[PDB]
């Protein structure tokens, strides 16, 4: 019997409903439980799923240089194979063998907006309409019934605002009609009102630190100097920060996790843009394992047959939790606050006058 | 005041301009709605047949669609395999040339790296739209059992980590290059010039009056 | 050393380093900028 | 004497008069007032706030009593406020009418999508028609 | 030929079953696109 080390991590390996009345492999379900069964079938072996004791993926202890996690179980002779979302990395490939990737993934942007009101009419247009606004109140100011001079000014200005408000109305109708689904790393890089960051250590931070690509170098320059810190200790902290910071934080993380969270309640986050880089999860075997070759070929077969795509769809989308005929209050609300603000400003100007 | 004669004139003229400005507004909404209707994704492509679309006649992209079990991609496959005239091209260069010479009636499904490179080349008439449909990777190859394999792999990890591969892509795609959502300022600008022109005309009529 | 995709069929006969560049199937269309004050004279005919 | 279709296979074994009635394959798909299609465009929550701000301005002006700059900007800002709202209502009402026109009217409509499933008798001439057809819409 | 199956002809020659069906139909070549948006009743 092959001892398979794995890790409790949704949706890869999870405790089954009623697991306490089940035994052995039947206690668990998920993407990697299904994958383990397929690999075992194709290679022709019996196996036992064992959850790694420390709940870790695998890193060398700073003090002792001893490997923890699933990598530890392999290098110190406790397990025959690891079937888990274990990233193919240089430091690990030096001590264990990885199959070709069974899942590809990359760094991705997670986001949770009065900015849907500033979009229809461009910021540049709101500006000019204000410049021409005072540009007319100054022309009329030089004038002082049918005063032909300033008369055509009021008419032309009226025709001007007529076109604009018509454009705003027409354009606003478009987004709410078609409605096709921050939208890019490029967008993030060009601004600072929406802060963005990563886990405070690990590969995502390192990607940005090392990148020679202009957009990611710009992002790294911002993130490393930002105050308060844009870095978090855990994925949960990062995701909470996205959810509770009033749209002022975007979180950079692995696409698989981003995609998974997008399909769970409360259905308030989403992945934007493509992946920013590429890496893979692989099946790991100890050096010298007679399973190495068969496992690698099994992974390539399952990939080429379309089984792995289907399996990802099952656990992310089929098991997910998340036409149109409704209008929201959000956008309209932003115009209410600017109204009360104007009323308050007037209530202030009134007091001073008296 | 209530001069019934010219009174109904002001009313009818008001109802007249009301209809016109309403028509202008409605029509202008349609020009932006259709402007979005004009391809931005695979899903957009999958939904129609004004714009033909194909892939290399043999290769992994054609196969991806042939084998796919995803609804959008399967819809795109049944269309492509029966499209006439043929939407498949013999070479990648043909697929790019076909896009460029089909007057907006052909979209080409190719690798993202190539698509983004052509987008930075004159005549600057092509555009990359939608997210990637799958994920693959380029790798340096060696004969099996080659003494060069270990070192060469380690070198790639290193260059990536030093940020060198990203520098190289930006250098060849963007530095050496030759070329978001909502509305533009262009159209609105034309109405600004006619405004200032009206103000100037008034500033002229004012001076003469005095 | 070229833009050669890592595929199963090839991996079964040669060795491949980890990917030096990522890619995926994307869409190329003939065109993202178009002013022309003539988009204002169109809605309401001359 | 019944609604029996004249087919080759049957004609080879029985005699058929000329047709007493014509037919062909067609599509079957599943009044609608409700004043609640007017309260939808502008949300009940929005109708409320627009009324609260409504009396919220008539009370601010009430504290004021030509070019009275104070209440002047109030009338201007309130105007800009209602302008946005009525524009939003108009735009939103258009999408509900645009899509209402966009929901099946032909085979071609059917052939183009997958929100609305569609099928035929499990055995018979209609199923066969589609199985054998060489017409692009029908083959799709 | 496009020869219509008719009683007067079926009395003197034999017709196959129809090779083409057809019927009476309306051919047409409008300020009425302005009266449509807002119904006459409205």
Summarize the structure.
The structure is cut from a larger assembly and holds 2 copies of chain A and 3 copies of chain B. Chain A is an alpha/beta fold and 354 residues long.
Gross morphology of chain B is: elongated
Strand order of the largest sheet of chain A: 9-10-8-11
Quaternary state reads part of a larger assembly
Number of helices of chain B: 9
H/E series of chain A: EEEHEHEHEEEHHHEHHHEHEEEHHH
Name the chain pair whose interface involves the most residues: A-B, 61 and 61 residues
Count of helices of chain A?
A: 13
- Within the largest sheet of chain B, what's the order of strands? 1-2
What is the gyration radius of chain B calculated from CA atoms?
Answer: 28 Å
Q: For the CA atoms, what is the radius of gyration of chain A?
A: 29 Å
Reported for the largest beta sheet of chain B, the result is: 2 strands, parallel
- What share of residues are in beta strands of chain A? 5-15%
SSE layout:
The structure is cut from a larger assembly and holds two copies of chain A and three copies of chain B.
Chain A: E1 2-6, E2 14-15, E3 28-29, H1 31-43, E4 47-51, H2 69-75, E5 81-82, H3 90-93, E6 96-98, E7 103-105, E8 107-111, H4 123-137, H5 148-175, H6 185-189, E9 195-197, H7 203-210, H8 214-225, H9 235-244, E10 249-254, H10 255-262, E11 270-272, E12 279-281, E13 284-286, H11 292-304, H12 307-318, H13 330-353
Chain B: H1 4-36, H2 42-46, E1 52-54, H3 60-67, H4 71-82, H5 92-101, E2 106-111, H6 112-118, E3 126-129, E4 136-138, E5 141-143, H7 149-161, H8 164-175, H9 186-209
Parallel strand pairs in B: 1-2
PDB class: signaling protein
Keywords: AMPA glutamate receptor, Signaling protein
Entry title: Cryo-EM structure of GluA2/3 AMPA receptor heterotetramer (model I)
Summarize this structure as a short list of keywords or feature phrases:
part of a larger assembly; 5 chains; A: 354 residues; alpha/beta; 13 strands; elongated; B: 210 residues; mainly alpha; 59% helix; signaling protein; AMPA glutamate receptor; Glutamate receptor 3; Glutamate receptor 2
């Amino acid at each position: 019997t092959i001892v398979v080390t794995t890790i409790l991590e949704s949706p890869y390996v999870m405790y089954k409903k009623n697991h306490e009345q089940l035994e052995g492999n039947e206690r668990y379900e998920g993407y990697c439980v299904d994958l383990a069964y397929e690999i075992a079938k194709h290679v022709g072996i019996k196996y036992k799923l064992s959850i790694v004791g420390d709940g870790k993926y695998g890193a060398r202890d700073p003090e002792t240089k001893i490997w923890n996690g699933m990598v530890g179980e392999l290098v110190y002779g406790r397990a025959d194979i690891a079937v888990a979302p274990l990233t193919i990395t240089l430091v690990r490939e030096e001590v264990i063998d990885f199959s070709k990737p069974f899942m590809s993934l990359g760094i991705s942007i997670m986001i949770k907006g009065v900015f849907s009101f500033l979009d229809p009419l461009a910021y540049e247009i709101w500006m000019c309409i204000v410049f021409a606004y005072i540009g007319v109140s100054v022309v009329l100011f030089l004038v002082s019934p049918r005063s032909l001079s300033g008369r055509i000014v009021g008419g032309v200005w009226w025709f001007f605002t007529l076109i604009i408000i018509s454009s705003y109305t027409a354009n606003l109708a478009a987004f709410l009609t078609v409605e096709r689904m921050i939208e890019s790393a490029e967008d993030l890089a060009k601004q600072t009102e929406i802060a963005y960051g990563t886990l405070d250590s690990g590969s995502t931070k390192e990607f940005f630190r090392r990148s020679k690509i202009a957009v990611y170098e710009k992002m790294w320059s911002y993130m490393k100097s930002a105050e308060p810190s844009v870095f978090t200790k855990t994925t949960a902290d990062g995701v909470a920060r996205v959810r509770k910071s009033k749209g002022k934080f975007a979180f950079l993380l692995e696409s698989t996790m981003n995609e998974y969270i997008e399909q769970r309640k409360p259905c308030d986050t989403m992945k934007v843009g493509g992946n920013l880089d590429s890496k893979g999860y692989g099946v790991a075997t100890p050096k010298g394992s007679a399973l190495g070759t068969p496992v690698n070929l099994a992974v390539l077969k399952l990939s080429e047959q379309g089984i792995l795509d289907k399996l990802k769809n099952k656990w992310w989308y089929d098991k997910g939790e998340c036409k149109t005929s409704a209008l929201s209050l959000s956008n309209v609300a932003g115009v209410f606050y600017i109204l009360v603000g104007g009323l308050g400003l007037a209530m202030m100007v009134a007091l001073i006058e008296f | 005041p209530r001069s019934l004669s010219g009174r109904i004139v002001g009313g009818v003229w008001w109802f007249f301009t009301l209809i016109i400005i309403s028509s202008y507004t409605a029509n202008l909404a349609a020009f932006l709605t259709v402007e979005r209707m004009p391809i931005e994704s695979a899903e957009d492509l999958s939904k129609q047949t004004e714009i033909a679309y194909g892939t290399l006649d043999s290769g992994s992209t054609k196969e991806f669609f042939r084998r796919s079990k995803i609804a959008v991609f399967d819809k795109m496959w049944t269309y492509m395999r029966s499209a006439e005239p043929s939407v498949f091209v013999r070479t990648t260069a043909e697929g790019v040339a076909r896009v460029r010479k089909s007057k907006g009636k052909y979209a080409y499904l190719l690798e993202s790296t190539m698509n983004e490179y052509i987008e930075q080349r004159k005549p600057c008439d092509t555009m990359k739209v939608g997210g990637n449909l799958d994920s693959k990777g380029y790798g340096i190859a060696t004969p099996k059992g080659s003494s060069l394999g270990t070192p060469v792999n380690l070198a790639v990890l290193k260059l990536s980590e030093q940020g060198v591969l990203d520098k190289l892509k930006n250098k060849w795609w963007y530095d050496k290059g030759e070329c978001t959502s909502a509305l533009s300022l262009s159209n609105v600008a034309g109405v600004f010039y006619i405004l200032v022109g009206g103000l100037g005309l008034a500033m002229l009529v004012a001076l003469i009056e005095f | 050393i070229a833009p050669l995709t890592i595929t199963l069929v090839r991996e079964e006969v040669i060795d491949f380093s980890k990917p030096f560049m990522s890619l995926g199937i994307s869409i190329m269309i003939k065109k993202k900028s178009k002013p022309g004050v003539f988009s204002f004279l169109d809605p309401l005919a001359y | 004497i019944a609604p029996l279709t004249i087919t080759l296979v049957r004609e080879e074994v029985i005699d058929f008069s000329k047709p007493f009635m014509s037919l062909g394959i067609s599509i079957m798909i599943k009044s609608k007032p409700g004043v609640f299609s007017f309260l939808d465009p502008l949300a009940y929550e929005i109708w409320m706030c627009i009324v609260f701000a409504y009396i919220g301005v008539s009370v601010v002006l009430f504290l004021v009593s030509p070019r009275s700059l104070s209440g002047r900007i109030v009338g201007g800002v309130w105007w800009f406020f209602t302008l946005i709202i009525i524009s939003s209502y108009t735009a939103n009402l258009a999408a509900f009418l645009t899509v209402e026109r966009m929901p099946i009217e032909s085979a071609e409509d059917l052939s183009k999508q997958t929100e609305i499933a569609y099928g035929t008798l499990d055995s018979g001439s209609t199923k066969e028609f589609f199985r054998r057809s060489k017409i692009a819409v029908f083959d799709k």
